[PDB]
Amino acid sequence: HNMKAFLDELKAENIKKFLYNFTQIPHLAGTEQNFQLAKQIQSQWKEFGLDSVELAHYDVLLSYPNKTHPNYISIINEDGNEIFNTSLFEPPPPGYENVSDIVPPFSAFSPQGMPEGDLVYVNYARTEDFFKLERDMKINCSGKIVIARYGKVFRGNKVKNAQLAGAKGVILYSDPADYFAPGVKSYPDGWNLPGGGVQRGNILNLNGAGDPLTPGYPANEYAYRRGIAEAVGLPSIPVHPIGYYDAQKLLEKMGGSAPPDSSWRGSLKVPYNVGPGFTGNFSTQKVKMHIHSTNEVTRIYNVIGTLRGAVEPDRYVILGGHRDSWVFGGIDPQSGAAVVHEIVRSFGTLKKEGWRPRRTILFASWDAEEFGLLGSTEWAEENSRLLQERGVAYINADSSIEGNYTLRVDCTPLMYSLVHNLTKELKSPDEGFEGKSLYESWTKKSPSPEFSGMPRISKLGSGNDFEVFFQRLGIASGRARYTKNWETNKFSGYPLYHSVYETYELVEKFYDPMFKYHLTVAQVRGGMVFELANSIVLPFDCRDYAVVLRKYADKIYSISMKHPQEMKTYSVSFDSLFSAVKNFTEIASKFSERLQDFDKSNPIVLRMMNDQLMFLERAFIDPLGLPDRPFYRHVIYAPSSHNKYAGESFPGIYDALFDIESKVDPSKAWGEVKRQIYVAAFTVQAAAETLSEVA
Amino acid sequence: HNMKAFLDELKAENIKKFLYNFTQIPHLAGTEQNFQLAKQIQSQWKEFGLDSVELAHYDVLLSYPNKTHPNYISIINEDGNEIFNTSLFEPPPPGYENVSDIVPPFSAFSPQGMPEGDLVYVNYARTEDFFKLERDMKINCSGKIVIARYGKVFRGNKVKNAQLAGAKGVILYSDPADYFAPGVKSYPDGWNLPGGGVQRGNILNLNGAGDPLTPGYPANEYAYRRGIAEAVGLPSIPVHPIGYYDAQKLLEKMGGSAPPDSSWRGSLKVPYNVGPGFTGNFSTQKVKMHIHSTNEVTRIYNVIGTLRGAVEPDRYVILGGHRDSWVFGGIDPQSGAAVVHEIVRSFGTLKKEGWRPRRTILFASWDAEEFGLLGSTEWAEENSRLLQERGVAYINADSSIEGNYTLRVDCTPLMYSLVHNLTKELKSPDEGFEGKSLYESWTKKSPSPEFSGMPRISKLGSGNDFEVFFQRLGIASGRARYTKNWETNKFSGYPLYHSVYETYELVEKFYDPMFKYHLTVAQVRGGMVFELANSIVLPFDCRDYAVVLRKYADKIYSISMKHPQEMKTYSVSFDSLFSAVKNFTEIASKFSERLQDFDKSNPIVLRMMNDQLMFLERAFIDPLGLPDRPFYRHVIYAPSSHNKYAGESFPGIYDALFDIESKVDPSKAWGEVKRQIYVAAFTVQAAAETLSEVA
Ligand SMILES: *[C@@H]1O[C@H](CO)[C@@H](O)[C@H](O)[C@H]1NC(C)=O
Ligand SMILES: *[C@@H]1O[C@H](CO)[C@@H](O)[C@H](O)[C@H]1NC(C)=O
Ligand SMILES: *[C@@H]1O[C@H](CO)[C@@H](O)[C@H](O)[C@H]1NC(C)=O
Ligand SMILES: *[C@@H]1O[C@H](CO)[C@@H](O)[C@H](O)[C@H]1NC(C)=O
Ligand SMILES: *[C@@H]1O[C@H](CO)[C@@H](O)[C@H](O)[C@H]1NC(C)=O
Ligand SMILES: *[C@@H]1O[C@H](CO)[C@@H](O)[C@H](O)[C@H]1NC(C)=O
Ligand SMILES: [Ca+2]
Ligand SMILES: [Ca+2]
Ligand SMILES: [Cl-]
Ligand SMILES: [Zn+2]
Ligand SMILES: [Zn+2]
Ligand SMILES: [Zn+2]
Ligand SMILES: [Zn+2]
């Protein structure tokens, strides 16, 4: 029919029931229950009316803790008496004491070992916090157990910095300064992190490789696997996460140097000292880790469902999201999985009455996402030759509500206006916004930092099941969800992230009692897919890309001009990049002018223009990729190696310019800067030339 | 109209006049006369009726000899008196004594130097001829001036082997055993190589990189060029070619070990001794080279003409060929350039009367081909993002007549059938074949070594302006020309290849007096392009690819089974490759069955199927390329690193298996073999799934 029938066919009660269904038993990747959930989801997707549902399985390397040999951290005296022990598991939430197969918290892919030695507080384990240790405080943290805190960076980056500094082991804890909202009670009577709550997650640095043992090719049965000595991204030291009830015991006895400033402090009742070892008599005590987790090749299943396109069955529009969890996944991911179920149940309801999308829709329940985005990456490695020539756009559907204040959208500039349009025709659940549109609430609560009256749309980064589609293949992608207040709350994620307390009751009683903030996210994702696979002309705008390209060029130019003297000695010129951006602007303007003087009743010319729009995003892909990152190939929006969390666009030039005043050879560094300027300008002009008149 | 009007619009007299025009003054790449020829060809192509003709210029690294410091080889005694000197130039052909700007023979990109030392005969400078030198002769040729002979390998491979063996310098000469047909007189009264005739050509090993200073990106003006220390493929020792009048003087005084066998011997009146140094008193004499050629960045222009497609202007069908020569280029390349000019004129004659191709045709007069395929490679590097999605197929047009006996076609298996059909509807110019078709003569003179009644079509290798289009981008390509007798003549190329004697009179009086063997090649290339850009359904057949894939898999398996013991210790299995080939066969059969039950009046489905056919070739492209060769990306037909001249398909597995019994670690070598089997099987299966029914 139209979107007026698809959007009003979604129900909050169906999402509620799907969340209840998916959030009662553990569904860790590679387990029996995850396979049972995959089979049940396949059956339900077949019943809803999908054209074909299949289970694509890959034998990928996963990590599990030993059920007989638990992992724990201890405080060891001179005689090895283990005077302190940390918790082997979190206290199960009420109503879940009899639920079996609950894996204890663990850092996935941590090597086995028994490290012993002194403790060094490292704060957030960033490059800034490791510079200060030896540059300023003269602390050598090599051979010592490094204890960091969650936040401000990815876990893999923390472990990588710890290895680069020579640490024997890594301990992670959730400080109540970053994971405890003020004036809120713990999970049983609130939504704050309890003291036994521990956050899980992998510590892998894959850089878009996927399964570590098969980089570049899928992990089918007839596959040659690298042994675990040349594997991609595996750490070399054991890691284990804890709560702030055991971390207090670990930190309370620390001694040595005082914290450098106030930012090297939290909300615990400890001095937060940095100096290696403990204080006083406790100086004769050290920390001993007991990590027994093992890596093994296990089979993971992705549920791939197809809805054939009526006019262009080879044009693939993908709505994907993962299915595996850590314990229960109340928000991450089953808050998104339940929304996906409703999206392809309303799609199935429209299909039953005889509706067919104009372009083929691929629905995907991925797997092994908490292990390095393995399922989606393997599937896209197996299907790259079809995705490159047939992938119109991708829509990621992870956790639906990390908050309850306002919407948050991260998409490519090609889908900005479309997003805005879809946000204008919808409604807002927020109090004081009844009878309004989601556009008004999203703009007022999240205004653009540059424009006035425009909502803020962030950048598409990495770390979810869109990295392979966007940063390696070059398919336009998009995320939409509901998040916290950007100013009043101001803490990382949500307190119960990757926790055993991330259950259904949390969402039902504290996050989304009426499942309205789930319904709105379901509507935005579904209508994103709907006007991404049914519009005659693809809803893509290149002038937004031109504007953001000019802005990014200005930002990179200012960052470079922060060093004006070296820009003059080695003749570093940004004129090529600015000229490329200007030509992109002009060619985009002329292509948009042709887009409004072209008859749409001709299938062939319509295909020409839609292919131009679809391969616009493809044209920013460098076949050789980024330096030392062959699978990060997006020239504009690839993650930067030096930050990877908040990095500016043009990652090549930003990486070249990063810490440029710290390299021994300045001529070589500025030659690298000039080479990246040349590559960026060539890529921008090449992407502009794809919108030039076709021969 | 049709091909009935385009084929009989070509004339032999127009080709004759174009060949006369293009072969009176020297046109070397990067010179004033080559630029004048480029401008004149641009003007004539505009006059014929091309839709848009432009001059795409790139500043690439070329090599030229010093006009004040000539290069020559001398025999130097103990006192440095230079008792012998080789020729500084070849005797100009009659009627060309007053022609200026004749560059003397030189090996392009040879480093400057004055090496001295003893001479070591090395025969054809292949890997076996260097194996024998120390394995059998106990002869160390490090620090020795290596003298080889043209043939059996590429010049760059000879120089690479010489560097790998430690030679100070390389001397090349044309043996009258390989470049002197029996019973034929020299060029003024025949077509045999004179004593002063010298063959030119580059000695670069670029492996598909293109311009050495800009690998992966075009050489525009805003380009960061690598200095000449990290340049791609540049040799490290001076090289100079000579004729067999001076090589006799160099070789006649040789001494030392006798030649291995009869194959280490030519037609000269010299003992062909291998031993380092000279014999007798001449042992106190050595060889001194005087190489002064310099490398510099020069601007090269490619003439790019566009004839818009009537129905699918996006779809590019390219007819390309280079324009630069060495002295006059009577056959190489202006025998092909004059044919290209006539094909463009015949296309323009139909264009004037109102005919438009269904798909866009790109005509290309490339440049700097004798320097490493630089012009075409730079143009395709600048236009890769359009070629990968719009390049239907490519047609190379180099030298037209390498001989006068029978046709020779080298194409991808997708264009086998079409070629046969085009060869059936044409005529045969050979004597005793009047009133017949080119099919009969081509089959009888060149029968298939496997089938009966089918003409022989060889493999698409490398070394011309199709390597970038085929072995990196993945565009179906084709070559058709006239060559010598495969068995009765049996010598390399033609005697006057890359010579100053390769003039217009040679072709007019000894090779093609009536320009009928030029007309047939013009017709086959023109009709190759015609039913490649005008047929409703792309004239591509996948079952030929399936059959040749089965044959190549059988050949690689038979090569591997020469080591059955190691195939069992390390569990080397080819079952994956054979299963992939079988699935490709089945899916190709089913897709071909859908190709004959599909209504062609629907533009959208026609586009779907033609895109499937066009991207069939693109599906064999590995994004990561071959080991150590990032720009050789065709999985099936890429050149092999160990032979590069006569190597079997599946180059990855062939290079893995090459000299496998000579590696210290056998487990690692067979693991590499298994990895290449896995990659090949995955690529075959993936290319099969592109012809599977769309979602
Ligand atoms: C778990 O630990 C026990 C005790 O050391 C051991 O026997 C068992 O093999 C381990 N499980 C593994 C390695 O999967
Ligand atoms: C810590 O755990 C170890 C291992 O079970 C045990 O031997 C030790 O007694 C424990 N110590 C404390 C203080 O709980
Ligand atoms: C939901 O929003 C209201 C409005 O301010 C807030 O008071 C409440 O804490 C929010 N619930 C959460 C964040 O779980
Ligand atoms: C050619 O050689 C002469 C004599 O050594 C020299 O002066 C001139 O610069 C050379 N030409 C070059 C290097 O282009
Ligand atoms: C060889 O050439 C050099 C350089 O011009 C000259 O000095 C010498 O006399 C020549 N020798 C002979 C034998 O021609
Ligand atoms: C052309 O073909 C005839 C027929 O055999 C042959 O005698 C003649 O030598 C050929 N001309 C060449 C090869 O230039
Ligand atoms: Ca993989
Ligand atoms: Ca280049
Ligand atoms: Cl050719
Ligand atoms: Zn998630
Ligand atoms: Zn997660
Ligand atoms: Zn040529
Ligand atoms: Zn040539």
Coordinates of C-alpha atoms in Angstrom, one line a residue, chain A residues 51-52 214-220 222-224 306-309 311-316 360 362 381-386 388-390 576 603-604 607-608 611-612 615 618-625 630-631 633 635 667-668 670-672 674-675 678-679 681-683 685-687 689-695, chain B residues 214-220 222-224 306-309 311-316 360 362 381-386 388-390 576 580 603-604 607-608 611-612 615 618-625 630-631 633 635 667-668 670-672 674-675 677-679 681-683 685-687 689-695:
Chain A
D51 CA 9.9 -15.2 0.4
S52 CA 12.9 -17.3 1.6
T214 CA 39.9 -16.0 7.9
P215 CA 40.6 -12.3 6.9
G216 CA 39.1 -11.4 3.6
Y217 CA 37.3 -14.6 2.9
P218 CA 34.3 -16.3 4.6
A219 CA 34.6 -19.1 7.2
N220 CA 32.9 -21.9 5.3
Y222 CA 36.3 -25.8 3.0
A223 CA 38.4 -23.1 4.6
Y224 CA 42.0 -22.7 5.4
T306 CA 14.4 -12.3 1.6
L307 CA 11.5 -10.2 0.3
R308 CA 11.8 -10.1 -3.4
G309 CA 11.5 -6.7 -5.2
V311 CA 10.4 -4.0 -10.1
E312 CA 14.1 -4.4 -9.2
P313 CA 14.6 -7.8 -7.4
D314 CA 18.4 -7.4 -7.7
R315 CA 18.4 -4.1 -5.7
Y316 CA 19.2 -5.1 -2.1
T360 CA 14.4 -6.4 -2.7
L362 CA 17.1 -8.4 3.0
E381 CA 32.7 -11.4 2.8
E382 CA 30.9 -14.4 1.3
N383 CA 28.4 -12.1 -0.6
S384 CA 30.7 -9.1 -1.4
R385 CA 30.5 -9.7 -5.2
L386 CA 26.7 -9.3 -5.0
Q388 CA 29.0 -4.3 -4.4
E389 CA 26.8 -4.2 -7.5
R390 CA 23.4 -4.7 -5.8
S576 CA 44.0 20.2 -4.6
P603 CA 13.0 2.5 -16.9
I604 CA 16.5 2.6 -18.5
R607 CA 18.2 2.9 -13.7
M608 CA 21.1 5.0 -14.9
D611 CA 22.9 3.5 -10.3
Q612 CA 24.7 6.9 -10.2
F615 CA 27.6 4.1 -6.6
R618 CA 30.8 3.3 -3.7
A619 CA 33.1 5.9 -5.3
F620 CA 34.6 7.0 -1.9
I621 CA 36.0 3.5 -1.5
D622 CA 39.8 3.2 -2.0
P623 CA 40.6 -0.2 -3.4
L624 CA 43.9 -0.3 -1.4
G625 CA 42.2 0.9 1.8
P630 CA 43.2 -3.0 4.1
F631 CA 39.6 -3.5 5.2
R633 CA 38.4 1.5 2.6
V635 CA 38.1 7.6 2.2
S667 CA 60.2 15.5 5.8
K668 CA 58.8 12.0 5.6
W670 CA 54.9 15.8 5.8
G671 CA 55.4 13.8 2.6
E672 CA 52.9 11.3 4.0
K674 CA 50.9 15.4 1.1
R675 CA 50.3 11.9 -0.2
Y678 CA 46.6 13.8 -3.0
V679 CA 44.7 10.6 -2.3
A681 CA 41.6 15.1 -3.5
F682 CA 41.7 12.3 -6.2
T683 CA 39.0 10.4 -4.4
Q685 CA 37.2 14.4 -7.8
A686 CA 36.6 10.7 -8.8
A687 CA 33.4 10.6 -6.8
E689 CA 33.1 12.5 -11.9
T690 CA 30.6 9.7 -11.4
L691 CA 27.8 12.3 -11.4
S692 CA 29.2 13.9 -14.6
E693 CA 27.1 13.2 -17.7
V694 CA 27.3 9.6 -18.7
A695 CA 29.4 9.7 -21.9
Chain B
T214 CA 52.3 6.8 -8.9
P215 CA 51.1 3.3 -8.1
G216 CA 47.4 3.0 -7.7
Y217 CA 46.5 6.7 -8.6
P218 CA 46.8 8.7 -11.8
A219 CA 49.7 11.0 -12.6
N220 CA 47.9 14.3 -12.6
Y222 CA 48.5 17.7 -8.0
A223 CA 50.3 14.4 -7.6
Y224 CA 52.8 13.3 -4.9
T306 CA 33.6 9.1 -27.1
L307 CA 30.6 8.0 -29.3
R308 CA 27.5 8.1 -27.1
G309 CA 25.3 5.1 -26.8
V311 CA 20.0 3.2 -25.4
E312 CA 22.7 2.7 -22.7
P313 CA 25.2 5.6 -22.7
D314 CA 26.5 4.4 -19.3
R315 CA 27.8 1.1 -20.9
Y316 CA 31.3 1.6 -22.2
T360 CA 28.6 3.9 -25.7
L362 CA 35.2 4.7 -26.3
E381 CA 43.5 4.5 -12.7
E382 CA 41.9 7.9 -13.1
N383 CA 38.6 6.3 -14.4
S384 CA 38.5 3.1 -12.4
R385 CA 35.3 4.1 -10.5
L386 CA 33.5 4.5 -13.9
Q388 CA 34.2 -1.0 -12.8
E389 CA 30.5 -0.2 -13.1
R390 CA 30.2 0.8 -16.8
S576 CA 36.7 -27.8 -2.9
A580 CA 33.1 -25.1 -7.0
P603 CA 14.2 -2.9 -20.4
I604 CA 14.6 -3.5 -16.7
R607 CA 19.4 -4.6 -17.8
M608 CA 19.4 -7.2 -15.0
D611 CA 24.6 -6.6 -15.7
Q612 CA 24.9 -10.3 -14.6
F615 CA 29.9 -8.6 -13.8
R618 CA 34.3 -8.8 -12.5
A619 CA 33.4 -11.6 -10.1
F620 CA 36.8 -13.3 -10.7
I621 CA 38.6 -10.2 -9.3
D622 CA 40.1 -10.7 -5.9
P623 CA 40.0 -7.3 -4.0
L624 CA 43.3 -8.2 -2.3
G625 CA 45.0 -9.3 -5.6
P630 CA 48.2 -6.1 -5.5
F631 CA 47.4 -5.0 -9.1
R633 CA 43.6 -9.3 -9.3
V635 CA 41.9 -15.1 -10.0
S667 CA 54.4 -27.7 5.7
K668 CA 54.3 -23.9 5.2
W670 CA 51.7 -26.9 1.3
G671 CA 49.6 -24.7 3.7
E672 CA 50.1 -21.9 1.2
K674 CA 45.9 -25.2 0.5
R675 CA 45.1 -21.5 1.1
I677 CA 43.0 -23.8 -3.3
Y678 CA 40.6 -22.3 -0.8
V679 CA 40.8 -18.8 -2.4
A681 CA 37.4 -22.4 -4.9
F682 CA 35.7 -19.5 -3.0
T683 CA 36.2 -17.2 -6.0
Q685 CA 31.7 -20.4 -6.2
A686 CA 31.2 -16.7 -5.7
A687 CA 31.3 -16.0 -9.4
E689 CA 26.4 -17.2 -7.3
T690 CA 26.3 -14.0 -9.4
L691 CA 24.4 -16.0 -12.0
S692 CA 22.1 -17.5 -9.3
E693 CA 18.6 -16.2 -9.3
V694 CA 18.4 -12.8 -7.7
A695 CA 16.7 -12.4 -4.4

